[PDB]
């Protein structure tokens, strides 16, 4: 089921993509009930209650579809600023998409969209996320090195957003 996407992505999608561009998924567990997990990650304008990076977020107005964020980051990363939009976001469904359409590092037409789904962990209510990605390969990167540190990224994230969740899931 995950570890199925992550499959087809890694390749059918990288086989789609052009030769510029690159694509992976990433999926994690978590011992959490959905609506705890989706509550973190459908705050478009609070990323930061889970992104290890997150500095600051700036929303101007409602954070509804298609609104812009402006995310700062941590020092030590090939980046200081994001500007990003919301392209996506199902409280039915579960799923939220964003495209990265601005700042100062090097990840042009960078899209994600993220799905999250109910299961069993262990007897518990559980949750299962997929995150997965396409972006550019910047001038003089290959696509495997683009995905490695994207996928690092991605990891990072869904790692926090484990740990957040199921902190909060024993209360
Ligand atoms: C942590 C970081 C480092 C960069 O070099 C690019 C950028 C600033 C966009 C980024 O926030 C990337 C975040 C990513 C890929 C996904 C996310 O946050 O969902």
């Not at 390749?11 to 694509?23: A, P």
């Not at 939220?96 to 601005?102: E, H, T, V």
């Amino acid at each position: 089921g995950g570890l199925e996407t992550v499959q087809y992505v890694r390749t059918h999608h990288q086989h789609l993509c052009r030769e510029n561009q690159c694509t992976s998924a990433l999926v994690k567990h978590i011992k959490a009930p959905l609506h705890l997990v989706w509550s973190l990650v459908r705050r478009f304008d609070q990323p930061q209650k889970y992104k290890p990076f997150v500095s600051r977020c700036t929303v101007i107005g409602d954070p509804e579809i298609g609104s812009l964020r402006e995310v700062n980051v941590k020092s030590g990363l090939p980046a200081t600023t994001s500007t990003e939009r919301l392209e996506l976001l199902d409280d039915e469904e579960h799923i939220l998409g964003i495209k990265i359409i601005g700042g100062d590092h090097r990840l042009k037409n960078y899209s994600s969209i993220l799905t999250v789904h109910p299961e069993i962990i262990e007897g518990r209510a559980g949750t299962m996320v997929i995150e997965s990605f396409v972006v550019d390969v910047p001038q003089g990167n290959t696509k495997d090195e683009t995905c490695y540190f994207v996928e690092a990224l991605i990891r990072c994230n869904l790692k926090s957003l484990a740990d957040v969740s199921e902190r909060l899931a024993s209360q």
